[PDB]
Structure formats: structure tokens, C-alpha cells
Symmetry: D2
């Protein structure tokens, strides 16, 4: 019997604004130069975006237009909301100053995770936290609730009973909105259009507490309310705290940065082990030394749910997966402008991303000797 | 049998520069106004520091002098190193626009952890990673190795055998340095002055791999090499990945921000459970809803090492600890300028910090009914 | 027979926005510390104000609130106008690191001028250019023309016939406005409310050309349209080109800066010579060497209109006026927060400023031996 | 009998640093796109360059490399001098969002001047002020005085006797320098290498005062000492105060901006009148209305030195010169990357610039009927 909690934030949360600008700049560069080196760090606050860092590329991009386009899409288009794509400041401080045996670009450690408690092999709490804010954005943009504004957060507390979901104990939904909607109207609409359509009714009972805009009015937000920086939502981006984290941010980094590529690979590995039926849950840790191709370490954790000995799993992983930094890029077909889409609503659990394919599961299952004997 | 890896970075790593500026600004404010509200986000890169965010305070501080003093102390005092305290740009964009029942200032989730694998009740990998970079800084500043420069990283891979440390498998030490030292000289000096004095000789064997400045020369660094931002080393700041993380950054936040205060409290709770002998390792999760005083959730995880039933532990925690946001500040005496010291070499494991006191351990032990029966 | 032209700009022109922020910061400091050293340079463009330079002061000022207050007063309060006081970025980069024999703080040259072609002893073209934009601001702010927006420019071409004003040949008035007013409506209203009430009807004839918003619609302006910097309207600030200029900017400089104080003194000198009847027009040049109290040069130019020999005038000036840098501050009572008012609509010709007093005129006249002999 | 004073500043003065960055960016764009629209405003101070404004161009330029290259050429290459090309911050905030009948892009007024008191038809004071700082830069860069640093100023006071140069009354030379040179050594070297080789010995007498580094040591300078902005040396750029000024800055503006093109044209006109022998000195004023091709006014001032009636001169100017904004660009062949060279040591008096050609002088002389009758 334990209570576990995860959160997510909408595309209009200031940290998420920064992540999406960083990745919109990455995508624009990769469209022209797939092998670009990009380390693009964004900082947003009242009236301004600062886009900085380092790029090595043949590409020619307009950082200001990409930034303004990104903010406009998120929905900040007027001073009444606290922030305007068309009239904010955009400052740029980007410095433009056998292949599988290439060393890691940096040291570090990265984790990946999978669990069969959902069909996408993700933890339920982060899954439903993301779906809530993704729903908030959908009913804002489609005109179902046209008074919604871009900045929102969600938080879901699940109840477990020896590792089985019993229900949802608590739900937090805080949304920005225009001045005209009153709080009772806002709470009813958020319950009917956002919460009830996303959370399974089975998990919602008399024991469920709902905190909808628990401080009431939330008119001013996005960067006016809170400074936002790239890489400040790394637990929202991953597994909502259910799994460990190595500390590296994803957004604004090209696929040569093992902080992103090896975390994607570790998800792919974990997900294929669980899809194979070789465990019910699996956490992978990998680590690198700058200038060294072979990871300094690989760890496979199955929390006692493995269907074959743990040492045999570690072997299967070395056998089927090339975790050298350029083996990663090959393994996942990463040199394409696919990253802006990851930079809100989570890097995992959306099954069109290359690191969410379970195209190794039968291979691992066969290689492990799992198959039924008769008679 | 598993390999686990943690890293740390010196006070001269650009992300750590940002953390220390943010907390130097917090301390300067709390010295004058202990109840200040501070959310100070720093961004450093080639030639500049940007210090931004939001403060509510009666204090009057010189952000530029605090910044320059902080960078000078870290050791960046010349263009030859890539960055100069005295001549860099400092830009400021800080907007200055029953008490225990006060609501949390934000939603979120926070973890704390303790393990008796070290005397300070920390995981060994993060402990020894921090000690390595702390040693690098000490031999740089005391003139033992005067050619060292401020930017460094460490990484240590431990070998476990069913949860007992067998040894150290791999050690990474990457340090900045002046142009005059050659790499063989640098590797010998780092082995003799930094590595061998910090890592127990028992754990160092023929199986131990050493990667000292594995890309060779590292003359240019700090902000010139890599943009740095507040809150981009949250796993170095905590448990090196051994424990989970809720995603919140510590530095530049006053103690009313549950991202910092509740993580400190969760460490205090976990550490006192383990010091009490109520478990060998303990992870606490807590979460809040904005405007709500009582946490939305509390979870006590003991990984099967508890000495009393798990439900009884959850009770002991509600009984002995007030996890309401202002109960935290009272519980830990937090309204003092003590934070710059946390902003490099880890927020945990240094036992003079208030959240590292084990002043509840005997209390919890007595309350749990642990004591020996004779005859 | 010659045509001469001068321009002026409203308080909402971006260069004038910068001047007024610089001087609002100066005034706020002098209110607390009359002997402050201030060199405050402002830069405005789309979404941002940067306030920089150097101050030596005991004062404690909130640069962000002063900036936002200044922009709000000018009238930029919405993204629809291109700029919002409440939601723009404000960045600060101000470094806070016998008395009459004190040296000049810098070298330089400064001119002052007076002419009896107006009652305020100013050239008519700059006088009427300022009055036009000052009128534009008055009918905008008083609701006479509520659709006006803050950014405007004026330009007036006078016809002279051997140095006597014959009339006005050309009038330019370009004003920002809201989207709702059509251009014919705007032209009629500007002619009736701004032009006809300010320019003497005697000077307006069939030969007069009027260019009112000659490019038509002007909805977007202020910083969105044009970057603005302190000290980029030095000819609008002075004599509209009728007199020479030494190149120094006024705004954001305390009275120890001879670029401001000696130009004010040179106006005072010229104005008192002309008010004395010792010439009909008078241009003064003074210059300084850094660290030298006595000006390196003084020149008195009367364009052949002197009523006493030129050498005798130069003597009268050395006799009645102390042009040493601290003699200036004493001569004009300058250590008071009086400067924001100078930073739009001209530093000269408004007779409540201390350098516009003619309290030496009778003294100079008596000392020159001008007085009527009878019989 | 009158004393007149002019100043100049070296390429390392912070305002001049800004002018040269603005024009280096203009040149880089015009090299690729001769018809680019450019309005590039620079701001330099401790540790940073901000390059902003508005460009309409097909060109692709690296603002950061152009900036760093420009600062390096000027000579700021180390923190010991206060500023380093290689390690300063560069921030960019440039928004990239019958032909002779095209309207002026803005209103305004512009002056041009010529006088036969020098062979280049410039006033002597500005001529010799520029030559002094140009000499300071030459002996710094050629290693004659290798301890010189980039920031310097000059100021020269000439004595006139009814409009004829009698001599030089005062000379100011303030130069930055390294820590190693003492002030007596510096004064002797500046007198021998900079002053005596540039100023005619005839003009230097017992009455001449010399102020060499009159405040002594000047080690820290460039942007560390003083914020610099584009367009803050408009009187150094033109005629040193001898002639009037319309207020417009030159640097960072493409030739479609009448603030630059019409001032260049007005110099060309004045210079060709004086070279023709139609006056000994000539000041031209022109002015424009936004969206109007024909200037709102033209004024020809000859200070009583004309050799033909004044009305006939005004006619000659309308006849020989097309002052419509695109007539200017054609008249002077302006669509070429020639502007960085203007942005230090004066826009006039260097006779390879297109507006310094006297290719109309014989034409004007013939058209005026000036020629000798015999017998
Ligand atoms: N030549 C070099 N050799 C070795 N290490 C180097 C070298 N140059 C820089 N580094 C280090 O590499 C560091 C990068 O650390 P880190 O902040 O983790 O990078 P990041 O890519 O921004 N990721 P994170 O902030 O963790 O998401 C630099 O800041 C230096 O400490
Ligand atoms: N009136 C309000 N009511 C509720 N939520 C609000 C209100 N105002 C702002 N918020 C939200 O609170 C958010 C803060 O999120 P977060 O980024 O986690 O904060 P942080 O303190 O910088 N911590 P982190 O970046 O996680 O270390 C804002 O950006 C909004 O989404
Ligand atoms: N110690 C010093 N001795 C002499 N001159 C110095 C010293 N320190 C700096 N200076 C010079 O003084 C200059 C100031 O020039 P200037 O740009 O005219 O100043 P300003 O006050 O901004 N006025 P302006 O831009 O003309 O309105 C510096 O930039 C240096 O060239
Ligand atoms: N559509 C428009 N119609 C008319 N005037 C306009 C329009 N858009 C902007 N303007 C004005 O044109 C001004 C330009 O003034 P000014 O500051 O003299 O320009 P500049 O080119 O930077 N020159 P200076 O600072 O004088 O060297 C703008 O700031 C507005 O007042
Ligand atoms: K923040
Ligand atoms: K970075
Ligand atoms: K401009
Ligand atoms: K300045
Ligand atoms: Mg945040
Ligand atoms: Mg990292
Ligand atoms: Mg980093
Ligand atoms: Mg948070
Ligand atoms: Mg301007
Ligand atoms: Mg000056
Ligand atoms: Mg200046
Ligand atoms: Mg102009």
C-alpha cells in the first residue's frame, strides 16, 4: 500500500516554452544540416527570450523568426496574457565556433525505464499527468474552452496496493485563463472537459481529492509569472519520478549528445525487454567518459520481476544493442528534425518516436530461450 | 552483481557557477531580510552573466558586486582562462514586484534518501564523486597544483555484489588547466594529489579503469566552453542518481519554495529513519498542491530493509515531522544565509547543515518499540 | 532670402524614450544623493529596455520600476501600440564602482546660443517644431484626440529675407495612431487641433506646404519601429541646427559632466548677452581638458550684431561668469532632480530652468557702459 | 581674433568601437546585397557588445564573428586592457523583418561644409584633431610605441585673427597605455612621436599649452571605462563643430537613409562650390519629409565669401545636383562596402571617398560665368 505522485506542465509553462524554442532551433538546423552540432539554451522571462549556446553547422536559420513562431504557436499573442510573440524581445548569443568508434562528447549517466502497468509501457502517473495538460491545450486551441490561456500544470497521486494501481487519490489542475471566466465556471469546465474525459472513471471514487485552480484566479502567467529555462522539467520529460534520472537535459541538444541519445536508447532497451516478456519492469543505467566510445558502465535493474537470470539480461543487452555514441544514432535513426514534438508532453510514451518501437522484443525473447514446452 | 555510476562537477563548471551566483544573491538578501521571497535564475556564457527572476524583499543588494565576487572566489580572473570576474558583463533582470497553515507556493514532488553504506548515510558513488572535485578545487586553491583551473568533472563507477560495495570499477577525472603543464605530468599529478588521497585503496584494484583528461588538453572552459544555467545539476546536488528526483532545482530559491525546503525535509526524515535503525535504506516522496498546506502525498520506501512494518513507518513520519510548508522552515531553522555553501559539492552529506542532524533518531527508535528483551 | 529647417520629436519617439529613462534614473538618484556621479545610457527596441553605464552614489533606486513608470507616463501600455510598460523586458547593466578648482571630468567642446527672433531668445524653427510635438502629446493625453499614439515627429521650414522671418514654407507632422482613424480624418484633426493652434496664422500662406502623415498609416512605432538610444537627438535638444554643437549628449549625465553643465552655462551666457542688448544673436563656444578647471578656450560669436566691441564682450564673459566645472554647478544651482523635464521638448526655451534666467542682463549692460546721454 | 576648438577620438574610444561594429555589419551585408536596408545600432560596455536594429536583406552574415573581428582589429585582445575580442559577450537583437522618384525614408535635416583653409577643403581644427588620434593608432600598431593601448582622445584649439589661422593655442592628447610606462616617459614619447610630427611647427609657439594625459595614468579604458553607443560622435564624424549639424548619425545606416546619404551629398556640393572658386567657405542645409522625393528645403550659406550672387548659387545647386534620395545614391555610387573605413577618423577630408571628388568644380565655374576678360 503506497501513494505515488507525478506532475506535468503544458506547452505554455515558461520552462516548457524554453525547451520548445531550444528544440525548434535544433529542428530548423537539422532540416538543413542533419549532422549539425547544437547546444541551444533558452531563457525566458518578462518581455524577453534569450537564445544562446553553441552551434557547429552549415545551416542558415533566423533565430528570431523561429522563436516568435514557436511562442505564437504556444499561444502567447497579447500583453493581456503577460507575453506576446509579435512584440517581445528576442536576443541571440549563439557562438557558431570507423565513425562508430567516435568517443562520447561528454561524461555522464543516463537512465531508461519501462513498466507494463500501461499499454505504452510507461508509469501510469506521468502518463495521466501528461494527458491532462495535453487535454487542457487541445480544448484551449480547438475553441471548446476559448477562455483558457497557455500556462497550466497537472499533478496525479495514484494509490498502489503491493504494486497494483488501486485508483487515483488526488488530482491537481491549475490553468491560466482570461479575466472574464469566474472560478466556479472554470472548475466545472475543467472537471467536465479536461479531468473526466482523461482519467478512467474506475480510478475516481469518493476518496479522490480534486484541487482545481486551488489558489483561484490565474490570469498572468507564462514568462511574466515565472522565469523559464531549458532543461528545468527533466522529470516531466522522462518518467515523472517513478524511475531514476542522470541529470542531463534533452532539449536544444543534437543526437551526438549522449545526455539525449543514450537516454533515448536506454528507454528503447528497457521498453524492448518489457515488451519481450523478460521482465514486468526494467530500469537501465548507462554512463560514458568524454572521448571514450564504450560506456563506462551498463546496469540492468528488474526489481525482482525478471523472467530470466539478471546476468543473462546484461548479456542480451550487450549482444542486441550498440550503446556506443554513434551506434545510438544508427540504432534510432536520429538525424532528422523530430525534436520540437518531444519538447512538450513528454519524450516517452508516444509510440511514433523511434526509441518507442518494440522491433527487438521477439528477437530478445527468442535469444533468451523463452517458449512453451508441450508433453 | 551490478555496476552503478555517479558524477560530480567542481565549483568552476558553468552550471555550478550559475547555482553559486543564484545562492550568493539569496544569501545576501537573507542576511538583511530573512523572510525574503527569492527566485533567482542565473545564465552564464562567453563574457556574460545574466541574473534574473523575482524577489520580494526589503533588502538592498548590489547584484553586480555579488556576481563578480562569486566568480572571483571560484577563480575566473583572466581572459586566458576564458572568463574574468573583473571584466565580464553582468546584466540584471530581477523584478522586485496561524502561519503554519500557509499553503505551498507551488505544486510539485520531492524525494529524500538515506543509506547506511557510508557514515554520512549517503550513497558511496555521489560521496566519492563530490570528494574528487572538492579535492581538485582544494589542491588548485592551496597552490599544491597551481596550474589547475576552475572547471572540472568527476565520475565514479562502483561495483556492487548483491548490494554490497565490492570496489571501484572506473574513475573519470577531467580538469581544466593552464597551457604550461603537459598531459603526462597532469595525469600523474591528478592520480597522486586528487584520486589516490580520496578513494579508499581497498576499492582500487587491477580491474579499476582510470580516464584522466581522456581528451587531453582542457585549457578553455567555464562559460567560454559551455553555457551554464541554475538548476542544471540537480542529480549532482542530491544523490547522484541512486535515489529518485522530483525535478525541482534548489539554488536561488528561498526556504518558502517546497522544491528546496521539502527536499531538505525529506532528506532529514530519511536520514533519521536510517540513523534510528528502522531501515538500512529509505526513500521519501512528498508532494504538494499550490495553496494547500498538507502534502497531497507522502510515500516511505524502504526496499525491503525496514525493521518495523511499513505502515507503522508512515505513521511515525506523520507523528514526528510537520511537512506543512512552514512546519518545514521551523523544523530546519532555514531563515539564515546558509545556501551559497550548498551550491557546490552537494546539498547532502555535509553534517553541519540543519537537514543532516540526526536529532530525531532515538525518538523514532523509542516510538517504534525497538529495544532488546532479556531472559 | 534663405529657407531654414528644424525638427522635433515627441516624448514617444524611441530616442526620446531613452533620453527620458536616462534622466528619470538621474532624477531618482539626485533626489537621494545630490552629488551622485551618473552616466546612464539607455537602449530601447522591440520588447526591451537596457539601462546601463556607471553610477557613484549612496542612493538606492529600483531601475526597473523607474523605467516602467517612465514608459507608462509616455503612454506605451499595450502590445497593440508595439510596446507595453507593464510587460516589456527591463535589463540593467549599471556598474556602481577649494572645490571650484576641481578639473573637468572629460575634454570636450560645448556651444550655447541666443537670438532675439523669439521672446524666449530661441530660434523660431526649433521653437515651433517643439510646440507642434508638445501639442500632439497634449491633445493625445487630454482626450481631445484619443486615437493618437505616443510616437510623432514635426519639421518646420521658415523663410527668411535677409535674416527676418517672412513666413513658414513647409510643415511636416507625422503621428502614430490607432487602427480605427482613417487618414483624411487624421489629417483634418492634426491641421485643426495641432498645426493651426500652434503656428501663427500670419506665417501660413498659399506658399505653405503641409505634409501630414505623408506615408499614411502609422500604427506601429515607438521601439517596435525604430531602436532608440540616449543622446541621439542632440540637435532637437538644443537649437534645431541654427547654432553649432560640440557633440555631447545631455540625458543620463549628472551636472559634473561638462557636456551638460557647460552647454547649460553657455546658453545662460548667450541668453544674458542678448537680453542685455549687447547683441541680437550670440553663440558661445567653450572647451575643457580632462583634469583642468579653466576652459582650454572661450569664443564669443555675435555675427556682426554686437553693440560693443567683440574683445570687450569676451572680457565681460570672463568677468561675470565662472566657467570652471564647479563654478558652473554653483552658477546654475544644478544639484536637484530637474532633468527628466528637459529630456523631451528641448533643454532650452522653457524659462523656469535655471540656465534660462536673465538675472545677469542689467549687470552686463551696466558693465558695458550702454546708457543714453542727453543734451 | 577668436579661439576655436575641435576634438577627435581614436578607433578604440567606446563610441567609435560601436560606430565601427555598426559599419562592419553594414559592409558585410552590402558585400552580398548592395540594396540591403540596414539600421544597425551597437551598444558596448564592460564585457559585452549588443548589436541591434533592423535589416532587410538576402545576405547571410555572422554578427558575432564580424563583431569579434572588428574589436580584435581595434586592438582589444586581453582582460588587462579592460576588453577582449575573443572572450567578451556578443548579443544580437536584429529584426530581419521611376526609381529616382522614391520618397525619403524619414524626415530630417542635414548639413555639408567646405572651406579653403586646408588643401582637403576641411576646417583645420577637426583635420589636425583626427590626424593626432590617427597617428596615436599608427605608432601603437606599428610597434613604434608598443605600450600604447587603443583608447585615446585629441583636442586642438586654433587661434584665428579675423578668420586667418594664427597658430595653435592648446593641444590635448589623452592616451590609454600599459602599466609599465611612467607618465614622464609617456609625455615625452607622445610629444616626439604623435604631436610634433603631425602639427606644423609654424603653429607651435611659446603661447602653445600642451595637456598630455593631464590626469596621468590611463590603463583601463575602452568599454570598461565608458559605455559606447553608435552615433555619439557625430561632430567628430563631420566638421568638429565648425559647421552646423542636423542630428543624424551615419554608422550602421545603408545609403537609402538620407541622414547619411544627404550629408555626404551636402559635403560633395559644398566642396565642389569651394573647389570651383565660387566661395571660400560654404555650408549647405537640406531637409526631407518621409515619403517625399524633393527636399523640403535647400539652403546655401557662403558667409559673405561668394564670388557670384547667392540666388545664382542656389540655382547652380538645383541645376547640377539631384538631391532626391535615389539621385544621391546614383550621384555618389554608394552601393558598395566602403563604410567601415568612414567609422573612425572622420567621414570627410579623405579624398578617395566618392563625396570628396571635385569632379563638378570646373562645370560649376563655367556655368557661373567665372573667366578672365582681356583688353
Ligand atoms: N576539452 C574538454 N575536455 C573535457 N571536458 C571538457 C572539455 N571542455 C569542456 N568540458 C567539460 O564538459 C562540461 C559539460 O557539462 P554539463 O553541464 O553536464 O553539459 P550539458 O551538455 O549542458 N548537460 P546538462 O547541463 O547536464 O544537461 C563543461 O562545462 C566542462 O566541465
Ligand atoms: N496564480 C497561480 N496559480 C497557480 N499556479 C500558478 C500561478 N501563477 C503561476 N503558476 C504556475 O506555477 C509555475 C511554476 O513552475 P516550476 O517551473 O516548476 O517552478 P520553479 O519554481 O522554477 N521550479 P523548477 O523549475 O521545477 O525547479 C508557473 O510557471 C505556472 O505554471
Ligand atoms: N583616466 C582617463 N584619463 C583620460 N581620459 C580618460 C580616462 N578614462 C577614460 N577616458 C576617456 O574619456 C572618454 C569619454 O568620451 P565621450 O564619449 O565623449 O564621453 P561621454 O561622456 O559619453 N559623452 P558623449 O558620448 O560625447 O556625449 C573615454 O571613453 C576615454 O577615451
Ligand atoms: N510609418 C511611419 N510613418 C512616418 N514616420 C514613421 C513611421 N514609422 C516610424 N516613423 C518615425 O520615424 C522615426 C525615426 O527617427 P530618428 O531617430 O531620427 O531615426 P534614425 O534613423 O535612428 N536617425 P538618428 O537617431 O536621427 O540618427 C521613428 O522612430 C518614428 O517617429
Ligand atoms: K523560475
Ligand atoms: K550547456
Ligand atoms: K535607430
Ligand atoms: K557613456
Ligand atoms: Mg521552473
Ligand atoms: Mg551532463
Ligand atoms: Mg549543463
Ligand atoms: Mg517545480
Ligand atoms: Mg534615431
Ligand atoms: Mg563627449
Ligand atoms: Mg560618449
Ligand atoms: Mg534622424
Amino acid at each position: 500500500k503506497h501513494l505515488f505522485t507525478s506532475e506535468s506542465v503544458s506547452e505554455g509553462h515558461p520552462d516548457k516554452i524554453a525547451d520548445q524554442i531550444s528544440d525548434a532551433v535544433l529542428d530548423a538546423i537539422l532540416e538543413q544540416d542533419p549532422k549539425a552540432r547544437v547546444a541551444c539554451e533558452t531563457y525566458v522571462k518578462t518581455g524577453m527570450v534569450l537564445v544562446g549556446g553553441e552551434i557547429t553547422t552549415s545551416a542558415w536559420v533566423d533565430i528570431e523568426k523561429i522563436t516568435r513562431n514557436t511562442v505564437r504557436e504556444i499561444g502567447y499573442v497579447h500583453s493581456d496574457m503577460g507575453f506576446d510573440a509579435n512584440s517581445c524581445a528576442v536576443l541571440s548569443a549563439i557562438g557558431q565556433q570507423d565513425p562508430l568508434e567516435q568517443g562520447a562528447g561528454d561524461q555522464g549517466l543516463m537512465f531508461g525505464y519501462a513498466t507494463n502497468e500501461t499499454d505504452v509501457l510507461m508509469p501510469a502517473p506521468i502518463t495521466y499527468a501528461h494527458r491532462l495538460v495535453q487535454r487542457q491545450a487541445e480544448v484551449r486551441k480547438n475553441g471548446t474552452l476559448p477562455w483558457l490561456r497557455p500556462d497550466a500544470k497537472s499533478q496525479v497521486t495514484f494509490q498502489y496496493d503491493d504494486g497494483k494501481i488501486v485508483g487515483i487519490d488526488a488530482v491537481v489542475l491549475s490553468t491560466q485563463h482570461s479575466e472574464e471566466i469566474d472560478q466556479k465556471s472554470l472548475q466545472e469546465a475543467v472537471m467536465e472537459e479536461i479531468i473526466k474525459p482523461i482519467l478512467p472513471a474506475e480510478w475516481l471514487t469518493s476518496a479522490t481529492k480534486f484541487f482545481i485552480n486551488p489558489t483561484g484566479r490565474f490570469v498572468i502567467g507564462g514568462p511574466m509569472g515565472d522565469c523559464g529555462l531549458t532543461g528545468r522539467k527533466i522529470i516531466v520529460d522522462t518518467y515523472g519520478g517513478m524511475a531514476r534520472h542522470g541529470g542531463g537535459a534533452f532539449s536544444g541538444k543534437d543526437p551526438s549528445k549522449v545526455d539525449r541519445s543514450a537516454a533515448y536508447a536506454a528507454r528503447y532497451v528497457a521498453k524492448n525487454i518489457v515488451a519481450a516478456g523478460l521482465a514486468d519492469r526494467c530500469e537501465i543505467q548507462v554512463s560514458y567518459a568524454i572521448g571514450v566510445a564504450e560506456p563506462t558502465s551498463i546496469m540492468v535493474e528488474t526489481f525482482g520481476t525478471e523472467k530470466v537470470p539478471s546476468e543473462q539480461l546484461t548479456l542480451l543487452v550487450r549482444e542486441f544493442f550498440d550503446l556506443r555514441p554513434y551506434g545510438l544514432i544508427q540504432m534510432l535513426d536520429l538525424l532528422h528534425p523530430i525534436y520540437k514534438e518531444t519538447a512538450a508532453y513528454g519524450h516517452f510514451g508516444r509510440e511514433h518516436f523511434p526509441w518507442e518501437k518494440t522491433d527487438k522484443a521477439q528477437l530478445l525473447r527468442d535469444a533468451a530461450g523463452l517458449k512453451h514446452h508441450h508433453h
